[PDB]
Design a binder for this molecule. Structure first.
Ligand code: CHL
Ligand code: CLA
Ligand code: CLA
Ligand code: CLA
Ligand code: CLA
Ligand code: CLA
Ligand code: CLA
Ligand code: CLA
Ligand code: LUT
Ligand code: LUT
Ligand code: SPH
Lengths: 213, 227, 229
């Protein structure tokens, strides 16, 4: 009925199309168990959201780098910020780990006991941490626009858009890493080199991707 | 029954002959979806009309102005007075605004049939619009639709298809030889065994790029010939 | 019924009740009742602020053609110090915004005058105070409300255009209008820049990166200059 990752192949039993972006792609059966699939769903959503933020930031910084704005590349921004501003790298790492630890720990214990964070033990906030579904934490803090509490069809469509954009951003980040390790320049520099000559500037002519070329 | 495109073939079940110019030709089956079929019919009508306008424009331009190349006629240095060396940005702005308005109206007519016939400023000025892609009224002031519209629409779609083929032939002829269709026809008539596609092919007269005032526009031929 | 797209089906959450309802919500940000109630006040405040700002910029340029509005906060000297002016503005604006916010969350709760117990605002809607705030109302209430929201939307887009034109050309609204009328085919944004697969040119930012205001170097950058076409 619904389209799958491999046309003609029947979709697995653990993938019935209830989740967003369900194409029945699981040849290794890593998510056959329900709890394991739940954990992997939250992991994929977090991965896609982080990948989306990273892809947007990398694209914007490379845009500012191509134009005469002085923006450093994404593979040198850390050194530029730490050396330009008197910022201690271990101190920043510890602060980031503290904030991420608090947020991810609350999220983890909410995954173990759904709705437990809504008891009011954190400054009295209750409905802001009640949670809607697995990997979809609705509330006035995470969703102040209230898009998750109205027009169910639009919400499901946005869920499909979010999972697809997340997978695309993950592939984009992997492409950024491979492009930097193979060509040595930024993603927009590679795009300009390819647009200048697409027949001779690609992965088949970089001299690194195809060793027999 | 109507005549099909191939002798002995069987026309598709979705092509019974209701629309004009239906030869029962659909090797890819792109007309299986009715919504997609209606959209493709509108797209074919737009392509047919635009191609007829382009073919007639190229021919009349080559007749009236035989020294101006239709391929390079888009340059600002080839525009006639008083539009010579005009800023192409404002020209693009004009075309974008007007074309965007009319195309949005046409698209809305396709999505919701008979919902944008009335003039939004002067009430009472509407168009009859019998079918999709056939507004009429102000668009057909001579009133030639009050008769046999089936054969007229058939002639329109057939002439449009011939014009589509003709304009693509014009593009490839100008890309391989570097001259207008009338000039290329005269050159072929001068020596048919010397000026044909057997020798003119493989050469792409279109340059690599063009510098229209400040920005550079990349150009290419339809085939990997010799630049 | 007037709509933002003739012959289009408006969204289910828009039934044409609120003023200026033209069935325009592709993202569905107004589907929720509470979100729509808050956004209505936000849009009203934005409308009035933008109308006041556009009128101020126009009168400022017409009366004073030598003072740039973008530089209005820089080349204006007053006996009242900038810190004192900021403190006065922060306290007064904080007081009025607190009263408005409390009326939003709790209607009919801050309509009473604290200094004098005899003054009190009459019952009204949220976002439309009335009473002392509306001494003269010439015309229909609903008609004037629709006119207010339409003028506010136009003023919001006008202020955005003012900022962008002042950042791209460095001229005021009247100056930009005259310059555009002088050479309309070459002074539009399409004439100033274009993007192609082989080249990406954008107009330069006429606003300096830093402004020396009493030796502090206030950064004044062009809004998303890297994303400029
Ligand atoms: C999340 C992915 C991530 C990736 C792929 C990189 C990658 C990189 N960082 Mg880095 N960073 C990342 C996160 C972070 N960095 C920094 C802070 C810095 C600094 C201060 C510097 C770098 C630098 C570097 C480069 C040198 C290798 C390195 O130290 O790798 C560490 C990362 C990985 C091995 C990958 C981790 C898993 C993916 C390199 C291209 C250096 C640079 O730019 O030199 C020119 C540099 O000086 N990063 C912070 C904040 C504390 C991060 C996350 O919190
Ligand atoms: C989680 C993804 C992610 C990560 C790890 C980074 C990381 C970084 N970004 Mg980036 N960015 C992102 C997403 C991300 N960004 C997105 C989605 C966008 C919009 C498309 C941008 C747009 C952006 C711009 C325009 C710039 C950066 C810059 C930077 C670098 C300076 C540190 C900083 O953030 O300034 C400081 C952090 C803050 C001001 C946040 C304050 C936190 C408040 C106080 C908490 C309360 C740093 C390496 C800057 C840079 O390139 O360095 C020169 C730069 O100017 N980013
Ligand atoms: C996120 C999608 C994506 C996109 C849009 C690009 C785009 C580009 N890549 Mg890249 N790449 C990607 C993913 C992507 N890549 C991934 C996941 C990897 C790891 C295997 C790489 C590894 C890679 C290398 C080593 C190189 C490039 C290079 C390039 C540039 C041109 C030459 C080329 O086509 O090489 C070929 C790219 C591939 C064979 C990767 C294709 C695999 C992905 C999954 C398909 C993406 C296609 C997408 C679905 C269709 C377009 C999306 C949309 C517009 C419709 C070009 C701008 C070259 C460069 O840097 O220019 C100098 C270069 O040498 N890429
Ligand atoms: C939609 C199809 C189409 C298109 C895109 C064009 C496009 C063009 N025509 Mg053209 N033309 C067309 C149909 C078309 N024509 C038809 C059907 C006829 C027959 C009536 C003509 C007869 C014609 C003549 C006689 C001339 C042009 C000329 C031109 C060029 C100058 C633009 C202009 O006229 O100034 C601005 C337009 C207006 C102010 C209106 C331009 C590239 C001129 C040219 O050759 O340029 C060198 C010119 O001399 N056309
Ligand atoms: C049917 C298979 C076929 C194939 C695969 C090719 C392939 C090629 N031809 Mg070619 N050609 C063909 C048939 C074919 N030809 C025939 C039948 C003729 C006689 C009319 C020619 C006459 C011809 C000339 C005059 C030239 C080429 C050239 C070339 C090469 C450059 C590509 C190009 O764009 O040139 C031209 C593209 C075409 C001719 C389109 C061929 C499509 C055929 C007709 C489909 C049937 C290329 C490898 C060029 C060359 O020699 O390289 C330096 C060149 O100058 N061909
Ligand atoms: C968004 C509202 C707004 C803002 C922030 C400004 C801000 C500014 N204006 Mg301006 N103005 C506005 C609206 C606004 N104006 C409107 C609507 C008009 C049309 C009547 C004007 C007409 C105007 C002129 C003619 C001039 C300015 C000038 C100035 C600058 C210095 C004047 C100053 O503040 O000293 C203090 C001002 C006074 C001490 C005068 C008394 C202030 C009265 C009593 C306050 C009125 C209260 C008001 C009715 C309440 C409505 C609130 C609502 C707008 C939110 C300054 C940056 C001057 C300038 O260009 O600088 C060189 C100048 O020449 N404005
Ligand atoms: C509020 C309506 C409005 C109006 C009347 C104008 C008018 C003008 N703009 Mg501006 N602009 C606007 C909004 C507007 N803009 C917005 C929202 C932005 C941010 C995207 C910009 C960004 C912008 C830039 C960067 C530039 C201009 C420039 C200009 C001037 C040159 C021609 C041009 O139109 O360029 C192009 C204008 C646009 C691409 C945006 C126009 C879109 C608006 C929203 C249309 C409003 C439609 C409405 C029915 C008509 C207004 C009513 C009117 C009859 C009173 C011109 C006087 C140029 C200039 O400075 O002059 C030298 C210039 O470079 N505009
Ligand atoms: C005083 C510090 C500072 C400076 C010098 C810059 C400078 C720059 N920024 Mg940036 N920015 C800053 C802070 C700063 N930013 C902060 C704190 C944020 C988070 C809100 C951003 C978010 C941001 C984005 C998303 C983008 C830039 C971009 C840019 C470049 C284009 C001009 C511009 O600012 O557009 C204006 C953008 C704004 C968001 C205006 C607000 C910035 C002012 C300074 C207020 C910040 C005050 C803050 C509380 C301290 C430029 C070199 C653009 C770029 O990278 O080009 C590709 C771009 O897209 N900035
Ligand atoms: C499904 C399945 C199942 C079956 O059974 C089997 C198989 C086949 C195996 C499979 C598959 C899988 C896969 C594909 C995976 C992948 C993933 C990824 C890629 C991720 C990423 C992911 C990615 C990510 C997160 C990323 C992120 C990023 C980021 C943050 C960034 C950041 C940054 C920035 C901004 C800039 C600066 O300057 C630097 C930094 C700091 C660096
Ligand atoms: C049906 C089907 C289906 C099945 O299933 C499959 C298959 C087989 C695939 C199919 C087929 C298809 C086809 C054939 C297609 C084709 C088309 C065309 C040709 C078009 C053109 C089309 C064409 C066209 C529009 C054209 C147009 C033109 C124009 C505008 C022009 C303009 C101009 C002129 C005047 C001149 C000047 O100087 C300049 C210019 C400006 C340049
Ligand atoms: C001048 C000191 C002002 C306060 C400084 C920060 C103190 C932080 C205390 C925040 C209070 C958190 C809990 C607040 C309300 C609780 O929900 C109720 N007391 C539970 O019944």
């Amino acid at each position: 009925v619904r389209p799958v990752w491999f046309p003609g192949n029947p979709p697995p039993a653990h993938l019935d199309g209830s989740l967003a972006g369900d194409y029945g792609f699981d040849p290794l059966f890593l998510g056959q168990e329900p709890q394991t699939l739940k954990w992997y769903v939250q992991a994929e959503l977090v991965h896609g959201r982080f990948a989306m933020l990273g892809a947007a930031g990398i694209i914007l910084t490379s845009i500012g780098a191509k134009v005469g704005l002085g923006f450093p590349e994404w593979y040198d921004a850390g050194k530029v910020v730490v050396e330009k501003n008197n910022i201690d790298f271990p101190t920043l790492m510890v602060i980031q780990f503290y904030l991420m630890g608090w947020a991810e720990t609350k999220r983890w214990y909410d995954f173990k006991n759904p709705g437990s964070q809504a008891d009011g033990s954190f400054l009295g906030f209750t409905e802001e941490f009640k949670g809607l579904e697995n990997g979809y934490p609705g509330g006035r803090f995470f969703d102040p626009m209230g898009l998750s509490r109205g027009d169910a069809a639009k919400y499901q469509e946005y869920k499909q858009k979010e999972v697809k954009n997340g997978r695309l951003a993950m592939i984009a980040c992997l492409g950024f890493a491979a492009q930097y390790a193979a060509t040595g320049k930024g993603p927009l520099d590679n795009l300009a080199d390819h647009l200048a000559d697409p027949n001779h500037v690609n992965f088949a002519t970089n001299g690194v991707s195809i060793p027999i070329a | 029954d109507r005549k099909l495109w191939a002798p002995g073939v069987v026309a598709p079940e979705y092509l019974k002959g209701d629309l004009a110019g239906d030869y029962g030709w659909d090797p890819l089956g792109l007309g299986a979806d009715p919504t997609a079929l209606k959209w493709y019919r509108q797209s074919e009508l737009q392509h047919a009309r635009w191609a007829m306008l382009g073919v007639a424009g190229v021919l009349v331009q080559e007749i009236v102005k035989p020294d101006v190349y239709f391929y390079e006629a888009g340059l600002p240095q080839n525009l006639p007075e008083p539009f010579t060396n005009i800023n192409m940005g404002g020209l693009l702005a004009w075309e974008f605004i007007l074309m965007h308005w009319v195309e949005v109206r046409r698209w809305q007519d396709y999505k919701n049939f008979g919902s944008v016939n009335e003039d939004p400023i002067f009430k009472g000025n509407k168009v009859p619009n019998p079918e999709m892609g056939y507004p009429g009224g102000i668009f057909d002031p001579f009133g030639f639709s009050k008769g046999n519209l089936k054969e007229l629409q058939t002639k329109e779609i057939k002439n449009g298809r011939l014009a589509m083929i003709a304009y693509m032939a014009f593009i490839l002829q100008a890309q391989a030889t570097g001259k207008g269709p009338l000039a290329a026809l005269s050159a072929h008539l001068s020596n048919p065994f010397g000026n044909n596609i057997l020798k003119n092919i493989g050469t792409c007269t279109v340059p690599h790029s063009v510098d229209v005032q400040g920005l550079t526009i990349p150009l290419t031929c339809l085939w990997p010939g010799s630049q | 019924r007037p709509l933002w797209l003739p012959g289009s089906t408006p969204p289910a959450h828009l039934k044409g009740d609120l003023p200026g309802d033209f069935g325009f919500d592709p993202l569905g940000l107004g589907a929720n009742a509470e979100s729509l109630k808050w956004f209505k006040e936000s849009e009203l405040v934005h409308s009035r602020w933008a109308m006041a700002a556009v009128a101020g910029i126009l009168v400022q340029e017409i009366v004073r053609p030598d003072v740039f509005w973008y530089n209005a906060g820089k080349e204006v000297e007053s006996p009242l110090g900038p810190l004192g002016l900021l403190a006065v503005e922060f306290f007064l604006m904080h007081w009025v915004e607190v009263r408005r916010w409390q009326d939003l969350r709790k209607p009919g709760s801050v309509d009473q005058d604290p200094i004098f117990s005899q003054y009190k605002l009459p019952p009204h809607e949220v976002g439309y105070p009335g009473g002392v705030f509306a001494p003269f109302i010439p015309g229909d209430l609903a008609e004037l409300k629709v006119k207010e929201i339409k003028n506010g939307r136009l003023a919001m887009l006008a202020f955005v255009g003012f900022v962008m034109a002042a950042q791209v050309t460095g001229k005021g609204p009247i100056a930009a209008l005259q310059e555009h009328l002088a050479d309309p085919w070459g002074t539009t944004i399409f004439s100033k820049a274009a993007v192609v697969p082989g080249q990406a040119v954008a107009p330069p930012c006429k606003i300096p990166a830093s402004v020396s205001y009493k030796g502090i170097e206030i950064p004044t950058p062009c809004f998303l200059q890297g994303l400029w076409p």
